[PDB]
Amino acid sequence: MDTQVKLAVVVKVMGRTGSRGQVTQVRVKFLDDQNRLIMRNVKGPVREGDILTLLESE
Amino acid sequence: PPPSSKPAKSGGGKQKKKKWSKGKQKEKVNNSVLFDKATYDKLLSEVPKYKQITPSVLSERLRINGSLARQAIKDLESRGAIRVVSVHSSQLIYTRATNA
Amino acid sequence: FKVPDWFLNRKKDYKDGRFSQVVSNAVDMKLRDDLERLKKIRNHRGLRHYWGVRVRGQHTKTTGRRGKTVGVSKKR
Amino acid sequence: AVSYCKPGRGLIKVNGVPIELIRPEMLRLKAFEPILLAGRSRFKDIDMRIRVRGGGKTSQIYAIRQAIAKALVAYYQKYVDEASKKEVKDIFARYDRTLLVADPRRCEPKKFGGRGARARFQKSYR
Amino acid sequence: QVVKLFNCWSFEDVQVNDISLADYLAVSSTKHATYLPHTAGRYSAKRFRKAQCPLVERLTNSLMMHGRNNGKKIMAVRIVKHAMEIIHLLTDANPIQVIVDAIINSGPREDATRIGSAGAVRRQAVDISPLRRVNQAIYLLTTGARESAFRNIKTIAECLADELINAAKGSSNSYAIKKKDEIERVAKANR
Amino acid sequence: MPTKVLHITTRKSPCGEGTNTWDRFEMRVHKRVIDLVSSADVVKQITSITIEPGVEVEVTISDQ
Amino acid sequence: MADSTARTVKDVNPHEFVKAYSAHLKRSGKMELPEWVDIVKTARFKELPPYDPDWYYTRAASIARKIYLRQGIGVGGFQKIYGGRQRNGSRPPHFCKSSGAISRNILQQLQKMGIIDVDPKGGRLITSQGRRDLDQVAGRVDVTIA
C-alpha cells in the first residue's frame, strides 16, 4: 500500500544526475487524493506543470 | 536464457535434441487399439463435456494425438453425429459434440 | 521400363551401363568402383581423389573444411 | 440519366464509376465482388459503406480497377461513391465527412540511392 | 446496428479496468472503431495523451514480425483472426476483451533501465509510460506464442490463443505474465 | 501529341578507385513528338520542308 | 435458376468451379494420352498417377475458364501460368515445368470435339459450343456458394 490516484503534477526535480537534462527521480504529488508525496522514478527530463499518471504505483 | 557452447575449428555447438515420439500414427490408426473405441471416446468424447467446443489443434495438443490421426477419428464421429465440425483454411477449425 | 548396357562389348572399364536403376547399395558399391576407377586410369578426376580435393569445382576462396580436414590451427 | 463520376486516386491503379442506382450488387472487371476478392479482410473495407449508412438499396456500384496487386484495390474504390453523394445532398455531407476520405498517401515506394542493399540501408561494411 | 470487425465481434462492449491504461487503449476511433488494416502518420508528441490506437492493429503487427523471418501481415492478420476465434471458442467471451485482460496482466507497472554514472552501473528502476506497457506486454505474448509454435505441434494461431488465455488468467505458464512479474520483481527490488 | 519517355541513366562511382558511395545519377531524357496532318497535300509537304525550324530538333518526313 | 448461372460462369472462385466442371468433363469420349505423359512431366511429385481426378481434368477445365475472358490465347499462354521458372538463388530450384508437350495435348482433344478453333496468328478463340458447356455448368456452382 501506497494509493493510486488519477493524474499527478511534478512538484520539483528532486535533484538527481543532470548536468544537461535529467534522467533520474522526481518528487510528485497526487493531483486528486492530495497530500501523499512520494518520489517516483521516471526516464527523461520534465518540466513542473507536466501532468502524468504514475499509474499503479503501489 | 542461454544458448549452448561455441564452435571449434570445424565447427559449432548446438546442445538440444528432444522428448520423443510415438503416436507415429496411421499404423496405429489402422489396427484396432487406438481406432476402435478408446481414442474416440477417451480423447474426443471425454474432453468435450468439460468444454463444449474446442479447436481441433488444441485437441491435438492436449490429447497428444496426431492431427491426422484424430482427423480420421473426428470424421467417424461426425458421421455418427456425435460431433459437428465447422471449417477453416489451415485445416484448423472447431470441434463440438452437441449444440446444447 | 527396362535399362541395359549395350553398345559393342568393347570398352573395358567404366561406362554407364545404362543408368543403374537399380539405385541404392548397388549404386553405393559402384560409386566406389567409379572412385577407384579414375585413379588407375590416371585421369584428372582420379588424380584428385588420391589427393582428396573436391572434384567438380568449388569456390575455394573459403569452405572446404570437410574436403580435407578441420580447421588446422594457423599454418606455417 | 444517372451517372456521376468524380475521380479520386490514391495509390497506382484507376477506378472509373458510372453508377445507376438500384439493388446492392458490386462488380469489378465487370465480375461479382466477393468472389473476385475471395479470402480477404481488406476486401470488406470497401463493403463498409454499402452497409453502414442505413442505405443498402440505393447504390449498385459498377467498378473497374486495372493494374497492381490485390491489396491496393479497396482504398480508392470507396472514395468515389461518397464524393458524388455530397454534391447533391448537403445533409449527407455528413456521410462523406465522418466516414474518412482523402489521402493521396504519397508514401508509395521511395528512391534508391546508391550504396543501399535495399536502397537506404547502406552496406554492413563499408 | 450490424457490427463489423471481421464481421463477427463487437468492441464498444470491451471494458478496460485500469483507468490509467484505459485512456491510452483506443477501442473507439473518430466515428467509432473498426479493425481493417492501414497505417496513418500521427508521430510522437510528449508529456500528454498523444496518439490514437488500436490494440488489434499492434497485436497482428507484433505477430508478422516476432518471430521470425519470412511472414507477412496478410498471414499475420490471418493468424490473429484464427487466434481470436480459437480464443472465443475456449473462453466463450469476446476475444478483444480477452486480449485486454492479457495486456493489463502482461503490462508491468515499473521497469529497470541501465545507467552508467560515476565509476559503476546502476539500475534504479523507471517509469514505463503507458504505450510502452501495452507493447512490452503484447510482445511478450507474441514472443511466447512464437516460441511455443517453434517447439510444439500447435498452430500459433492456437499458440497465440494459448499464450493469450494463460496471460488473460494470470497463469505463470504464460511467457508474457511470467516476464511481467519478473520485471516488476527486479524494478521493485533495485532501489 | 507528345508521347512516352526514353531514359538511359548510368551511375558510376566515377572512380577512385576505391570509390563506392556518393555515386551518380546524371540522368538523360530524350523526348518524341509525333504530329499528323489530316490531308498530306503536295502543297503541305513543300511549304513545311523549305522553312523547317529545327536547331537541335531532328525531324523525318515519312513514308508508307 | 439461370440467373446465378450465367454470370457465375465468369465471376466464381475457381476452386469450386474447376472441381464442379471436371466431373462434367469426364463423360466425354476422348482423353487419349498416347503414353506421352509418363517420362517425367511436371513439377516434382507430379508424374500422372494421381491425375484421373487431380491433373488431367482440372487442367482441361483449366484452359476453359481462361479462354473465355482472356482470348485470343496460345500455347505459350498456357505453358507459363502455373509455372515458376524463376531465376534461381542457385541453392534452389524450385520446380521445372515443360510445357509445350503439356499444352499441346489438352488443345488437340478439344478441337476434335469442336470446342476450340485457331486463328492464323491470334491463337485459338471460343466457339458457340465451348461457351455452351462452360456457362451451363457455372450455373450449378453459384448456388452451392450462396
Add this chain to the structure above:
RNA sequence: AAAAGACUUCA
C-alpha cells in the same frame, strides 16, 4: 566528479 599504458629514424 573520470577504468584504461604504448605508438622506430629523417624528411
Add this chain to the structure above:
RNA sequence: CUGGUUAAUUCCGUUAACGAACGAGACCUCAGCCUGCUAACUAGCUAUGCGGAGCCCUCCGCAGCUAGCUUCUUAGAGGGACUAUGGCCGUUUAGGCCACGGAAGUUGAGGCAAUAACAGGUCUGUAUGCCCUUAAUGUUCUGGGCGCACGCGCGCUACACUGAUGUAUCUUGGCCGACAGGCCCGUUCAUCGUGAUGGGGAUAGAUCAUUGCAAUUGUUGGUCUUCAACGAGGAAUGCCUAGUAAGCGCGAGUCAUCAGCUCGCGUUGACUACGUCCUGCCCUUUGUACACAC
C-alpha cells in the same frame, strides 16, 4: 566575440564596423505533384452494333480514327499553401502546438555540396614529364593459369507452420518433345505431424542439349541418384526514425558464357523516435612545453 533561433556566419536583435563572395537555402529534379481544365490520342470509359451466353432483361468478346470526352497517357499553365485568414503567454524577430485542405515553414529522398589540405588513391576508368629502350617490357597466335592444410571480408541459401509441396489464384502462332530444344509461317485445398524429416540442398558419380573451336583445374540448365554441415549462432557489429528497416521478384547494364555483381523499379510491409544520457562533429572557452602534429 555576444543575445536568440534554426539542418543551415539560416535569419533577426545587438556590436568598431560597413560591406562583399562562396557554400547552404533558392534552383532544375522526382515522389501524390493532384486538381477542375487548355492540348491530343496511345489507352480508358461510354455510346451504338454483332457473334452468342443465362433464362438487348443480365453478361463476355471484338467491330468502325464511328461519336465524344478522361481518371490512364501526355506537355503546359496554374494550384501551390504564403502565416494572405483566425488562435495562444511572450525584451523583441521567434520558438512550441493546432485547423481549412491533396499537403505547412527543417513536406520528403538526397541527385544540384564550399575552398583547401590529405607526397591519400588511380600511370590500367584518361593524356603524360623521365628512364628499362629502339626493325625490345613489339608482333600475330597456339596452349596454360584467377589451386585452398588455413584467417579476414562482403554476400546467398537454411535450421522449419511468418513453413513445406501440390493444385488452383527480341519474342510469338501452333505440330513434336521430360529439362535443355529444333522448326512453318511470319491465398485455395490433398498432403505436412513439428518429424535433423515430406527439413536442408551440400557433395560426388552417370549422362543429354545448348552458347563456343573447345565446358577438364574455368559455362549454364538438367534426366537421375547420392542425401553434407547446420536444432536460429559466441567474443562481438552493422544499419533504421514508417513507406524507412526488413522481406519477395524482376529489369537494366555486365554480357559469345556466368553463379551474383553493381544499379533502379514496383509490390509486401514492422518497431522505436525521447535525447546527446561509447563514436564522429559544431562553435565559443581556457591551458598548451606540440606544430606532417596525442
